[PDB]
């Protein structure tokens, strides 16, 4: 526990399933801690997690049990108290349903004391997309789709402009996830 700590930018967290959960900040560290733990006696006492993998794991569960849920992403700034961003506008759940959801999520994350559900404003999510693209003089057309919006970047983009556009998009999805606003580049000329 403190034992695992000494083994190693990480937070080691006790789980209700008697597992030890090592929270890492990114991919490189996740693989490193896995390499390290596998070489010794904790090799099956610990599991290394990070925000990208845990979002993927919870999204698969929700795909079946809450298949129409309008959500963004779960954030792990404090890994003992993950915060699940849901859409305020597109939420269809009563207060009691959201409480049930929080409890199921907590059961799915044995290292978490609680899972707070925060209702986020779609106007903010789309407004950060709009602002980021404008910040790069990227013309775009916003095109609504079923339960989403696509910002379609448009123009005869060169090498660097495409990379800058895609780097912005990746940074956008790290915050909001890719389930509401999505992006595309239409190449012209």
mmCIF file of C-alpha atoms in Angstrom:
data_model
loop_
_atom_site.group_PDB
_atom_site.id
_atom_site.type_symbol
_atom_site.label_atom_id
_atom_site.label_comp_id
_atom_site.label_asym_id
_atom_site.label_seq_id
_atom_site.Cartn_x
_atom_site.Cartn_y
_atom_site.Cartn_z
ATOM 1 C CA UNK A 1 0.000 0.000 0.000
ATOM 2 C CA UNK A 2 2.699 2.329 1.161
ATOM 3 C CA UNK A 3 4.610 -0.845 0.047
ATOM 4 C CA UNK A 4 3.427 -0.355 -3.580
ATOM 5 C CA UNK A 5 4.207 3.362 -3.308
ATOM 6 C CA UNK A 6 7.876 2.547 -2.564
ATOM 7 C CA UNK A 7 7.923 0.280 -5.629
ATOM 8 C CA UNK A 8 7.720 3.289 -7.941
ATOM 9 C CA UNK A 9 3.273 10.984 -10.387
ATOM 10 C CA UNK A 10 1.147 8.066 -9.118
ATOM 11 C CA UNK A 11 -1.538 7.640 -6.519
ATOM 12 C CA UNK A 12 -1.979 4.200 -5.006
ATOM 13 C CA UNK A 13 -5.546 3.613 -3.927
ATOM 14 C CA UNK A 14 -7.123 0.820 -1.894
ATOM 15 C CA UNK A 15 -10.096 -0.865 -3.512
ATOM 16 C CA UNK A 16 -13.160 -2.394 -1.876
ATOM 17 C CA UNK A 17 -12.384 -5.538 -3.916
ATOM 18 C CA UNK A 18 -9.120 -5.874 -1.981
ATOM 19 C CA UNK A 19 -7.153 -4.794 -5.104
ATOM 20 C CA UNK A 20 -4.589 -1.999 -5.105
ATOM 21 C CA UNK A 21 -5.221 0.553 -7.810
ATOM 22 C CA UNK A 22 -2.331 2.580 -9.164
ATOM 23 C CA UNK A 23 -3.604 5.812 -10.837
ATOM 24 C CA UNK A 24 -1.209 7.106 -13.510
ATOM 25 C CA UNK A 25 -1.391 10.408 -15.358
ATOM 26 C CA UNK A 26 -0.776 9.110 -18.874
ATOM 27 C CA UNK A 27 0.052 6.223 -21.199
ATOM 28 C CA UNK A 28 3.844 6.203 -20.841
ATOM 29 C CA UNK A 29 3.595 5.970 -17.053
ATOM 30 C CA UNK A 30 0.856 3.353 -17.187
ATOM 31 C CA UNK A 31 2.991 0.994 -19.310
ATOM 32 C CA UNK A 32 6.046 1.693 -17.155
ATOM 33 C CA UNK A 33 4.261 0.856 -13.895
ATOM 34 C CA UNK A 34 2.831 -2.237 -15.504
ATOM 35 C CA UNK A 35 6.352 -3.341 -16.642
ATOM 36 C CA UNK A 36 7.623 -2.717 -13.100
ATOM 37 C CA UNK A 37 4.768 -4.466 -11.222
ATOM 38 C CA UNK A 38 4.963 -7.512 -13.527
ATOM 39 C CA UNK A 39 8.600 -8.166 -12.577
ATOM 40 C CA UNK A 40 7.818 -8.719 -8.911
ATOM 41 C CA UNK A 41 5.403 -9.997 -6.242
ATOM 42 C CA UNK A 42 2.714 -7.334 -6.630
ATOM 43 C CA UNK A 43 2.266 -8.550 -10.249
ATOM 44 C CA UNK A 44 -1.263 -9.669 -9.479
ATOM 45 C CA UNK A 45 -2.021 -7.553 -6.448
ATOM 46 C CA UNK A 46 -2.199 -4.270 -8.315
ATOM 47 C CA UNK A 47 -3.943 -2.845 -11.379
ATOM 48 C CA UNK A 48 -2.685 0.316 -13.096
ATOM 49 C CA UNK A 49 -5.474 2.653 -14.269
ATOM 50 C CA UNK A 50 -5.630 5.976 -16.080
ATOM 51 C CA UNK A 51 -8.394 8.301 -17.207
ATOM 52 C CA UNK A 52 -8.368 7.154 -20.831
ATOM 53 C CA UNK A 53 -8.735 3.445 -20.028
ATOM 54 C CA UNK A 54 -11.301 3.923 -17.302
ATOM 55 C CA UNK A 55 -13.476 6.080 -19.585
ATOM 56 C CA UNK A 56 -13.294 3.302 -22.206
ATOM 57 C CA UNK A 57 -14.251 0.651 -19.583
ATOM 58 C CA UNK A 58 -17.215 2.611 -18.193
ATOM 59 C CA UNK A 59 -18.345 3.581 -21.744
ATOM 60 C CA UNK A 60 -18.580 -0.085 -22.661
ATOM 61 C CA UNK A 61 -20.750 -0.784 -19.630
ATOM 62 C CA UNK A 62 -22.995 2.179 -20.372
ATOM 63 C CA UNK A 63 -23.299 1.139 -24.069
ATOM 64 C CA UNK A 64 -25.430 -1.784 -22.826
ATOM 65 C CA UNK A 65 -27.082 -0.537 -19.600
ATOM 66 C CA UNK A 66 -27.703 3.159 -20.397
ATOM 67 C CA UNK A 67 -27.498 3.074 -24.216
ATOM 68 C CA UNK A 68 -29.235 6.415 -24.800
ATOM 69 C CA UNK A 69 -27.372 8.354 -22.100
ATOM 70 C CA UNK A 70 -26.157 11.804 -23.194
ATOM 71 C CA UNK A 71 -22.816 12.184 -21.445
ATOM 72 C CA UNK A 72 -19.425 13.668 -22.021
ATOM 73 C CA UNK A 73 -16.601 12.060 -20.051
ATOM 74 C CA UNK A 74 -15.503 11.082 -16.553
ATOM 75 C CA UNK A 75 -12.693 13.097 -14.990
ATOM 76 C CA UNK A 76 -10.216 11.729 -12.452
ATOM 77 C CA UNK A 77 -8.450 14.826 -11.079
ATOM 78 C CA UNK A 78 -9.214 13.302 -7.723
ATOM 79 C CA UNK A 79 -9.240 9.528 -8.470
ATOM 80 C CA UNK A 80 -11.000 8.793 -5.141
ATOM 81 C CA UNK A 81 -13.810 11.080 -6.291
ATOM 82 C CA UNK A 82 -14.308 10.789 -10.068
ATOM 83 C CA UNK A 83 -16.662 13.393 -11.602
ATOM 84 C CA UNK A 84 -18.974 12.211 -14.371
ATOM 85 C CA UNK A 85 -20.032 14.975 -16.780
ATOM 86 C CA UNK A 86 -23.537 14.506 -18.138
ATOM 87 C CA UNK A 87 -25.473 16.865 -20.426
ATOM 88 C CA UNK A 88 -27.944 19.126 -18.630
ATOM 89 C CA UNK A 89 -30.057 19.726 -21.764
ATOM 90 C CA UNK A 90 -30.146 16.159 -22.997
ATOM 91 C CA UNK A 91 -30.523 14.422 -19.583
ATOM 92 C CA UNK A 92 -33.833 12.538 -19.374
ATOM 93 C CA UNK A 93 -33.273 11.195 -15.832
ATOM 94 C CA UNK A 94 -35.010 12.202 -12.607
ATOM 95 C CA UNK A 95 -32.982 13.067 -9.534
ATOM 96 C CA UNK A 96 -33.506 9.537 -8.212
ATOM 97 C CA UNK A 97 -32.295 7.970 -11.468
ATOM 98 C CA UNK A 98 -29.092 10.078 -11.363
ATOM 99 C CA UNK A 99 -28.518 8.922 -7.786
ATOM 100 C CA UNK A 100 -28.905 5.294 -8.891
ATOM 101 C CA UNK A 101 -26.471 5.922 -11.739
ATOM 102 C CA UNK A 102 -23.908 7.403 -9.319
ATOM 103 C CA UNK A 103 -24.176 4.307 -7.170
ATOM 104 C CA UNK A 104 -23.727 1.942 -10.073
ATOM 105 C CA UNK A 105 -20.646 3.889 -11.195
ATOM 106 C CA UNK A 106 -19.237 3.725 -7.702
ATOM 107 C CA UNK A 107 -19.763 -0.006 -7.679
ATOM 108 C CA UNK A 108 -17.869 -0.201 -10.974
ATOM 109 C CA UNK A 109 -14.835 1.700 -9.555
ATOM 110 C CA UNK A 110 -13.879 -0.037 -6.323
ATOM 111 C CA UNK A 111 -11.239 2.660 -5.518
ATOM 112 C CA UNK A 112 -13.786 5.451 -5.644
ATOM 113 C CA UNK A 113 -15.407 6.830 -2.455
ATOM 114 C CA UNK A 114 -18.135 8.484 -4.472
ATOM 115 C CA UNK A 115 -18.940 9.413 -8.041
ATOM 116 C CA UNK A 116 -20.317 12.894 -8.446
ATOM 117 C CA UNK A 117 -22.528 13.518 -11.461
ATOM 118 C CA UNK A 118 -22.262 17.098 -12.804
ATOM 119 C CA UNK A 119 -24.770 18.427 -15.327
ATOM 120 C CA UNK A 120 -22.788 20.319 -17.971
ATOM 121 C CA UNK A 121 -24.161 22.933 -20.332
ATOM 122 C CA UNK A 122 -24.126 21.949 -24.040
ATOM 123 C CA UNK A 123 -23.646 25.644 -24.834
ATOM 124 C CA UNK A 124 -20.282 25.543 -23.111
ATOM 125 C CA UNK A 125 -19.172 22.381 -24.891
ATOM 126 C CA UNK A 126 -20.090 23.691 -28.313
ATOM 127 C CA UNK A 127 -18.820 27.184 -27.449
ATOM 128 C CA UNK A 128 -15.361 25.856 -26.615
ATOM 129 C CA UNK A 129 -15.290 24.136 -30.030
ATOM 130 C CA UNK A 130 -16.369 27.344 -31.793
ATOM 131 C CA UNK A 131 -13.832 29.379 -29.883
ATOM 132 C CA UNK A 132 -10.962 27.028 -30.437
ATOM 133 C CA UNK A 133 -11.505 26.876 -34.138
ATOM 134 C CA UNK A 134 -11.877 30.643 -34.438
ATOM 135 C CA UNK A 135 -8.653 31.032 -32.526
ATOM 136 C CA UNK A 136 -6.947 29.350 -35.514
ATOM 137 C CA UNK A 137 -8.821 31.244 -38.270
ATOM 138 C CA UNK A 138 -10.344 27.942 -39.243
ATOM 139 C CA UNK A 139 -13.484 28.529 -41.177
ATOM 140 C CA UNK A 140 -16.057 25.915 -40.516
ATOM 141 C CA UNK A 141 -19.659 25.077 -40.898
ATOM 142 C CA UNK A 142 -21.487 23.686 -37.953
ATOM 143 C CA UNK A 143 -23.741 20.839 -39.011
ATOM 144 C CA UNK A 144 -26.103 19.235 -36.539
ATOM 145 C CA UNK A 145 -26.432 15.464 -36.674
ATOM 146 C CA UNK A 146 -28.561 13.027 -34.678
ATOM 147 C CA UNK A 147 -27.767 13.849 -31.050
ATOM 148 C CA UNK A 148 -24.599 15.698 -32.017
ATOM 149 C CA UNK A 149 -22.956 18.563 -33.757
ATOM 150 C CA UNK A 150 -20.110 18.340 -36.266
ATOM 151 C CA UNK A 151 -17.874 21.343 -36.753
ATOM 152 C CA UNK A 152 -16.681 20.886 -40.331
ATOM 153 C CA UNK A 153 -13.435 22.698 -40.925
ATOM 154 C CA UNK A 154 -13.255 23.843 -44.523
ATOM 155 C CA UNK A 155 -10.553 24.995 -46.826
ATOM 156 C CA UNK A 156 -7.414 24.257 -48.759
ATOM 157 C CA UNK A 157 -5.448 23.466 -45.611
ATOM 158 C CA UNK A 158 -1.701 22.920 -45.810
ATOM 159 C CA UNK A 159 0.406 20.502 -43.790
ATOM 160 C CA UNK A 160 0.842 22.627 -40.672
ATOM 161 C CA UNK A 161 -2.783 23.825 -40.554
ATOM 162 C CA UNK A 162 -4.084 20.275 -40.568
ATOM 163 C CA UNK A 163 -1.732 19.288 -37.765
ATOM 164 C CA UNK A 164 -2.712 22.343 -35.715
ATOM 165 C CA UNK A 165 -6.428 21.585 -36.341
ATOM 166 C CA UNK A 166 -6.043 17.984 -35.320
ATOM 167 C CA UNK A 167 -3.977 18.886 -32.231
ATOM 168 C CA UNK A 168 -6.753 21.266 -31.123
ATOM 169 C CA UNK A 169 -9.357 18.526 -31.681
ATOM 170 C CA UNK A 170 -7.390 16.050 -29.658
ATOM 171 C CA UNK A 171 -7.067 18.539 -26.791
ATOM 172 C CA UNK A 172 -10.808 19.249 -27.048
ATOM 173 C CA UNK A 173 -11.720 15.543 -26.748
ATOM 174 C CA UNK A 174 -9.406 15.121 -23.725
ATOM 175 C CA UNK A 175 -11.733 17.532 -21.899
ATOM 176 C CA UNK A 176 -15.164 16.807 -23.340
ATOM 177 C CA UNK A 177 -14.913 13.381 -24.915
ATOM 178 C CA UNK A 178 -16.154 12.801 -28.494
ATOM 179 C CA UNK A 179 -19.851 12.021 -27.988
ATOM 180 C CA UNK A 180 -21.513 15.388 -28.621
ATOM 181 C CA UNK A 181 -19.313 17.744 -30.633
ATOM 182 C CA UNK A 182 -17.304 16.016 -33.364
ATOM 183 C CA UNK A 183 -15.015 17.415 -36.014
ATOM 184 C CA UNK A 184 -14.190 16.919 -39.675
ATOM 185 C CA UNK A 185 -11.970 18.539 -42.289
ATOM 186 C CA UNK A 186 -13.290 19.114 -45.798
ATOM 187 C CA UNK A 187 -10.347 19.461 -48.199
ATOM 188 C CA UNK A 188 -11.055 21.822 -51.066
ATOM 189 C CA UNK A 189 -9.446 23.133 -54.260
#
